[PDB]
């Protein structure tokens, strides 16, 4: 929420994102963080 900062993080829903990730990668059962 902008009232505090303006930094955000990204999540891809369905991907083996090690493979097609298109810093700070981390794999989840729910996708790419």
């Amino acid at each position: 929420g902008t009232n505090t900062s303006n930094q955000v993080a990204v999540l891809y829903q369905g991907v083996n994102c090690t493979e097609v990730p298109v810093s700070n990668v981390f794999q989840t059962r729910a996708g790419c963080l």
């Binding site: 369905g14 991907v15 083996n16 059962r29 729910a30 996708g31």
Partner: protein, 38 residues
């Protein structure tokens, strides 16, 4: 009173107890993993 079957067995792999496990297996449904019923 012996609440053995219902109380979760530590040795059981899943924390699910005897009765709980039986139930899960009966219903033919287990989506293991969600990185993608058809």
């Amino acid at each position: 009173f012996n609440f053995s079957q219902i109380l979760p067995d530590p040795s059981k792999p899943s924390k699910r107890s005897f009765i709980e496990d039986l139930l899960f297996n009966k219903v033919t449904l287990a989506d293991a993993g969600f990185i993608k019923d058809l």
